[PDB]
């Protein structure tokens, strides 16, 4: 019954608040809609009549998140995984600490941060002594060896 970027109150076609800004009070026949900015850690990404700004995403260090792009009054924080942490989904929503590779297995491919340590059976003639996310299968040196001992 009205235009885009407007809403209908009391048969009055009121303006919505622009992105960046939240509704403080509705228009009247004599007053425009009253909008104020969102605080530093909040945002509002649409033409709105929302009274509480969305909180920016917290990039929690305790879930392997760190800030990538910082929030604005119009846009959310974007997070990403810290070094040492990879995405649990191809839609990186939370981060798992890079897995390591137990003895008798070596390292095919080191963790990306959008992918986990890829891990390979140490073939006959090769061993891994310990568990790390880095060290690979090594040969037995010349003086028995096992998948895990020289």
């Amino acid at each position, epitope marked *: 019954a009205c235009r885009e970027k407007q*809403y*209908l*109150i*009391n048969s009055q076609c009121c303006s919505l608040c622009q992105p960046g800004q939240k*509704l403080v*009070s*509705d228009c009247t026949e004599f007053t425009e809609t009253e909008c104020l900015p969102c605080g530093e850690s909040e*945002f509002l*990404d*649409t033409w*709105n*009549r*929302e*009274t*509480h700004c*969305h*909180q920016h*995403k917290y990039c929690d260090p305790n879930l392997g998140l760190r800030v990538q792009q910082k929030g604005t009054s119009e846009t*959310d924080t974007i997070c990403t995984c810290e070094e040492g942490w990879h995405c649990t*989904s191809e*839609a990186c*929503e939370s981060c798992v600490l890079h897995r390591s590779c137990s003895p008798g297995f070596g390292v095919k491919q080191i963790a990306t941060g959008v992918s986990d340590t890829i891990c390979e059976p140490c073939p006959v003639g090769f061993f891994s002594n310990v568990s790390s996310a880095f060290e690979k299968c090594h040969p037995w040196t010349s003086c028995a060896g096992t998948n895990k001992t020289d």
Partner: antibody
Amino acid sequence: LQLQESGPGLLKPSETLSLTCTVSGGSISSPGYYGGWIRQPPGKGLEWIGSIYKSGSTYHNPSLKSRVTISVDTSKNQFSLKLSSVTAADTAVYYCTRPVVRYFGWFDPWGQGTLVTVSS
Amino acid sequence: AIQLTQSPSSLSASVGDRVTITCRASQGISSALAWYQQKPGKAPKLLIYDASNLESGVPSRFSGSGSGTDFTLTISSLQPEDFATYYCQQFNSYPTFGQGTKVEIKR
């Protein structure tokens, strides 16, 4: 645009309640898309549990402080609720909904509702 | 929390009769009132938003009015499929609903 609640209809005292709301006929990614949880003890009134913007930002009834987690999964087009340490008091029909113009409402559409009974 | 008190809480009425339900807010809530209709075993169904805007699809016999502290939902000719509980809710602050108003049909 429809919403379906899914979860268990029976749950023990002290267990945690886990419900999921599946959105069809529209994407939760659109600007302005919120989700909300309302509930209704049998033959009693309505209480808002909380709302969530697709961002993940969220508000909830102060009367469930430290018990409510509400989450959104853009990828699967679902949003969720966890209510910890449940009691007979939380037996109810739980509804997911679309807060339309802000966190606080109004609510349209709703889902069918899924009854949750808290019982040994 | 903003309390909403609906009057009455229950009523019998005849087909064709006019029924008004009121919703008093404990504080001013501007125009941010909505009304829902709930049929048994079904979810609330939006009738009215922003106090007086009637939801697309809903019959015109249903109308909304009021501002600040006092609101009314009016049914100008009760049909039998109107048996239901009616609820107002406010979204000026964190959401609260009234107790509901049960509507029976006298026949």
